[PDB]
Design a protein around this ligand. Sequence first.
Ligand SMILES: NC(=O)c1ccc[n+]([C@@H]2O[C@H](COP(=O)([O-])OP(=O)(O)OC[C@H]3O[C@@H](n4cnc5c(N)ncnc54)[C@H](OP(=O)(O)O)[C@@H]3O)[C@@H](O)[C@H]2O)c1
Ligand SMILES: O=C(NCc1ccc(Cl)cc1)c1n[nH]c([N+](=O)[O-])c1Cl
Length: 315
Amino acid sequence: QCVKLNDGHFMPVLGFGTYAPPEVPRSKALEVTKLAIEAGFRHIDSAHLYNNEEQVGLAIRSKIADGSVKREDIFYTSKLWSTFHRPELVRPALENSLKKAQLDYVDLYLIHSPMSLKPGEELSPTDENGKVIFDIVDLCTTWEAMEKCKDAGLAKSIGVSNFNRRQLEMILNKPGLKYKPVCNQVECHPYFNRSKLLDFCKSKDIVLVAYSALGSQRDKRWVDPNSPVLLEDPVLCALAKKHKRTPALIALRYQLQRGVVVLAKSYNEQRIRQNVQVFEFQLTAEDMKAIDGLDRNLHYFNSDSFASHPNYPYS
Ligand SMILES: NC(=O)c1ccc[n+]([C@@H]2O[C@H](COP(=O)([O-])OP(=O)(O)OC[C@H]3O[C@@H](n4cnc5c(N)ncnc54)[C@H](OP(=O)(O)O)[C@@H]3O)[C@@H](O)[C@H]2O)c1
Ligand SMILES: O=C(NCc1ccc(Cl)cc1)c1n[nH]c([N+](=O)[O-])c1Cl
């Protein structure tokens, strides 16, 4: 089940999230990506940041080599990390990701974040207060570099991630724009449902892709443990009992019914298979209204590390 993007390529509407924190052994990403393809996932979300592209790429190539899928059946995404926003660094970062995955192309390459970081060896160059060391880059010039990558065939489609509406607007009104972003991948779930951003994306034929749709991995680097746990929400739980589903399935189905493409990360064999059940049932209009009521402007990513950055999108 696929949505047609504004460049004419096609994106599966449920995607598998591959990130696991560093205490998870690298080899697991390989195992669980194969499991996710076996279960029916066809859209796979990785990044340079995640340090797993070699494992994710191998899982994909294994599922091609054993005859399970064709390359053309898999939609693989990676992302340009914030230290590589300077235009001259964009193509080389993409080539790096292709060599890691051993793929001839990515189906989608995103600017991972609007918050440009000082170029260098560190993923997160830090200032002493622990604030990321910012860089001033015109993201319009980073976007022109992305467009060159699509023109060379390195990425079939190009898009952005963590952009707010005004940031998206800036790209859209760029003089001489050749390709609009196909998508904006952002934090989106019933506690932060981004309905104003969704409406703007829909008006621009840009797909909103929801990450942390199940409420995030709750990593203490960036997430306050007092924050309400999305999957313990009583309304989602009540809806899970009503449909004899689970609160995750409720959270995933809500996105599809608003025209949002949705990611789900799991490294558990059972939950991976469970998550494809999103296609097996429907929420009613009143169910959707109840879930719309949960919105509380809650982004789980909420650290002093980035909240002072000049291009923080939640400002
Ligand atoms: N563009 C960005 O800046 C950005 C930011 C964050 C994430 N992402 C992408 O989006 C993906 C997903 O977001 P996320 O990693 O924040 O996690 P998520 O999809 O919100 O899932 C959070 C947790 O839900 C659990 N879970 C999954 N299925 C479940 C089920 N059926 N029942 C109960 N619990 C279940 C998982 O634990 P188990 O593994 O134990 O099942 C997972 O750790 C990431 O992996 C990454 O690919 C992108
Ligand atoms: O740093 C990350 N994103 C950049 C980012 C996150 C939030 C905001 Cl507001 C802006 C930029 C990250 N991306 N994916 C994962 N992951 O766990 O899947 C992590 Cl962590």
